Ligand binder design. Structure first.
Ligand SMILES: O=c1ccn([C@@H]2O[C@H](COP(=O)(O)OP(=O)(O)O)[C@@H](O)[C@H]2O)c(=O)[nH]1
Ligand SMILES: O=c1ccn([C@@H]2O[C@H](COP(=O)(O)OP(=O)(O)O)[C@@H](O)[C@H]2O)c(=O)[nH]1
Ligand SMILES: OC[C@H]1O[C@@H](O)[C@H](O)[C@@H](O)[C@H]1O
Ligand SMILES: OC[C@H]1O[C@@H](O)[C@H](O)[C@@H](O)[C@H]1O
Lengths: 271, 271
């Protein structure tokens, strides 16, 4: 379908949006920073396709206390104007708070008792209900826009403690006996376990692969240094994401401040 | 499928590849420039999928004289290592020169008598034979690498006489009675009629749409200022390409020199 007529500033080939940061990976995936995207054009494109986004959150034992702020801030900032289906995985269905949702948005509570990967790979339901899955930590809050600019077949998010580091400094799993093993001379980025996603197909592949690798490590008496994050990082090394989210998309202002290079802090740790 | 282990320089989030040029459109499509891509990673990715690329060229009447240099330079520079199927559309089958081709590459002569769009929309054959179609002018020669970095569902190429211009300066069709009409305040870029492409599906859509719009203009006694290029530009305005090729991909050194911003001249006009 054709975009309607729209009026917006012209891109200029000879003036970069951002000259301070890398905005495209070497396999030609956009790195999403403020100033790189016109949200109006993106909103039009995803709306024309009637895109539905699923958002998965786990809230088990004490973590149920984080849902109320998580959800209420999601209502302000996460895919507003688009269809959204929250999937809350919890051991305590009656501790899920009652959060008023905007039109076109709905919330399912799934009772459950490193196995987020496993639980995410609920497979037939997701395929019939949403186009994209976004998989985040619950101990977080949205503080600014997190929209359709993220959507793509496969994305991860650059780890805040790690974006300036040489790769030998990255906390990849370094022991060869782990399936998550990455040697010292390999690696593009350090991606966070707490904010990843993609098409339902690609996320099911990812979560399947990672769950299979963690089972293999288990049977071999090995647990990867950073658990499911370590396996994610090996997956994304071998299967390059089609977008990378900048640290704007997962930050901790208490621990890391608010540097100039981050024009927006969109989704952050809770105090 | 998983990429094998590979060793290559680390991307650095805090050091851009290119700070002199826009490398991502505002709808998050890569703009392909030298220094933005690691060809080794891209080659691995497209090879794992056994990608076949079709290259369509029209060589009608006197233009048959251009085929020999076109083809021989294509053999040196165009998708080398990948499977390639040249489709030469000509009124003179016996004037197609005999050009030795590398392994995994083949050439079909199609006899024919603004209607490139029409002829390109040969529909069932392309779908069964190639993954991507690239559609270029014949009066051209390859001088450097033109590879898989271009491939994507839909691409155009930024016009050399126009990449620094404000949009009101672009030679879009400006009369409202043409289907190719773009007003003064709209437009992202000026794309060349001579180098476009995409998945077979997306190119058939494009060529279909443009052929339909040119038929409508015909029945109304109108011909767009720059013919099929004008319609391409309207199409790509309303359906944004998923990559944009920089002017490295279509240049005229005689007329425009070799500016510093172009690190490579890959495909150029013939003297
Ligand atoms: O119900 C949960 C449990 C964990 N997490 C996230 O995953 C991280 C670590 O998981 P886990 O607690 O199992 O590791 P541990 O804290 O026990 O060492 C937490 O810090 C959170 O940011 C979450 O979102 N919901
Ligand atoms: O057999 C042909 C005829 C044209 N062209 C390309 O399309 C352009 C213009 O087409 P055409 O010649 O129909 O316009 P005209 O030159 O007659 O004004 C030429 O300059 C070429 O760059 C081509 O590749 N092959
Ligand atoms: O080195 C990787 C680790 O770095 C810590 O800052 C983070 O809190 C961990 O969850 C993990 O990402
Ligand atoms: O203004 C658009 C025109 O610009 C000319 O340089 C080019 O040779 C034409 O074919 C067309 O692109």
């Amino acid at each position: 379908v054709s975009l309607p007529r729209m009026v917006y500033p012209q891109p200029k080939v000879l003036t970069p949006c951002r000259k301070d940061v890398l905005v495209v990976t070497p396999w030609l995936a956009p790195i999403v920073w403020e100033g790189t995207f016109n949200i109006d054009i993106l909103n039009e494109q995803f709306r024309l396709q009637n895109t539905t986004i699923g958002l998965t959150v786990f809230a088990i034992k004490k973590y149920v206390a984080f849902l109320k702020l998580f959800l209420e801030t999601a209502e302000k900032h996460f895919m507003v104007g688009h269809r959204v289906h929250y999937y809350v995985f919890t051991d305590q269905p009656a501790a899920v708070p009652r959060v008023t949702l905007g039109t076109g948005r709905q919330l399912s509570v799934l009772e459950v008792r490193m196995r987020r990967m496993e639980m995410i790979s609920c497979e037939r339901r997701f395929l019939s209900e949403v186009d994209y899955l976004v998989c985040v930590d619950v101990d977080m809050e949205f503080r600014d826009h997190v929209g359709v600019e993220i959507l793509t077949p496969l994305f991860g998010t650059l780890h805040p403690g790690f974006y300036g580091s040489s790769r030998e400094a990255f906390t990849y799993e370094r022991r060869p006996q782990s399936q998550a093993y990455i040697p010292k001379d390999e690696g593009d980025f350090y991606y966070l376990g707490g904010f990843f996603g993609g098409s339902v197909q690609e996320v099911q592949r990812l979560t399947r692969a990672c769950h299979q690798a963690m089972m293999v490590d288990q049977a071999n008496g090995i647990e990867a240094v950073w658990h499911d994050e370590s396996h994610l990082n090996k997956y994304l090394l071998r299967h390059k994401p089609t977008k990378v989210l900048s640290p704007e998309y997962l930050w901790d202002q208490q621990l890391l401040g608010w540097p100039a290079v981050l024009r927006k802090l969109r989704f952050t740790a809770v105090p």
